[PDB]
Amino acid sequence: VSVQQSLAAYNQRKADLVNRSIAQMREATTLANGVLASLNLPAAIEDVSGDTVPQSILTKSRSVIEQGGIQTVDQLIKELPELLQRNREILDESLRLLDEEEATDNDLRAKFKERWQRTPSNELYKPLRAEGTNFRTVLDKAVQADGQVKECYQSHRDTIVLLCKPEPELNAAIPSANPAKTMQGSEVVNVLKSLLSNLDEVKKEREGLENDLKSVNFDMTSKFLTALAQDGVINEEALSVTELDRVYGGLTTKVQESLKKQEGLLKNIQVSHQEFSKMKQSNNEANLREEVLKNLATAYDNFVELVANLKEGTKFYNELTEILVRFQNKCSDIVFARKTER
């Protein structure tokens, strides 16, 4: 037993406590924000007009206008059969070269019998014909992909055209009426703002439950020595449990209560959210405004998916240009060399 042998013993445990609470504090904070963004919150009790057009929609509309519009798309669709057929004619001409030598060689071997000491004009052209069959299989998939995407385009063609044109003409399309009559006058809006403001108070209360926990410091060396003197040996584990639980009992309770309160609040708020967005139909005209925006989401995002397949293509044909030339000439080099000997 030396001069000092139980000083750092407590501080290590002090670290293994405060940090534990911080983890079970900040993690809960982020969890709340994630749910709000998923269910369109807290930005769902501010905008009210009906007549004017949305802001997010207005931004997406000008994005399509900025990148041309219906004209940029139509010119890409119309030129697809042009470029697709252009490659097809080169394909048939390349394969004709193989049939060319074979047509002459087959007739030559029949009449002139002295041509059986060399590789026939078939086995040499056999690996090349194997590549040829592969190409048409792609064309079937290329056309099939070309067909289904064109079908998806025409079904939502009117919606694409809708994206262009001036804004006032577009505004007339939007259902000019009150979004929901049961929002103004019913007790449904009132049982919502109060719920959020009560939940918001949790965030502000948590501000106090951070700096306080961080600045925890209380010297208590006298008690450890009391145990050393009275008992004889310092029991670090057993004595700490009885001591720390009593002094930091309410600190944990209020934290657990706040989490339990948040757990309790969120459970009732989620049901209120169901009650909040229940009246989609509402009275007579309300769901229609929602259905309008529903098609646009399936229009703007669909716009990207449709363009993406066009992006897969186009460049697809251009890189084929470098391939088909070396491919076509490769066959000619074999045929010409075969013709040279005789």
What does the chain come to in residues? 342
Which string of b and e fits 220-231 if b means at least 16 CB within 10 Å?
eeeebeebeeee
Task: Outline where 156-286 has alpha helix (H).
Answer: 157-163, 167-173, 190-214, 221-230, 236-247, 249-276
Nearest CA-CA partner of 299 in 38, 43, 147, 73: 73
Q: Domains in the chain, please, with CATH? A: 8-32+53-215+248-341 (1.20.140.50)
Angle at which helices 236-247 and 249-276 cross, to 10°:
50
Beta carbons within 10 angstroms of residue 333's beta carbon: 9
CA nearest to 30, candidates 262, 265, 267: 262
Residue 180's Cβ-count burial label (10 Å; 0-12, 13-18, 19+) is buried
- Residue 145: count of CB within 10 angstroms of its CB: 14
DSSP SS3 for 47: coil
Å resolution of this model? 6.5
Contacts of 101 (CB under 8 A, 6+ apart): 121, 125, 335, 338, 339
State the distance between the two ends of the chain, measured CA to CA, in whole angstroms.
Answer: 109
How far does CA 51 lie from the centroid of its chain? 32
Helix axes 236-247, 8-38, angle to 10 degrees: 50
The experimental method is X-ray
Specify the DSSP element, H or E, that contains 89.
helix 80-111
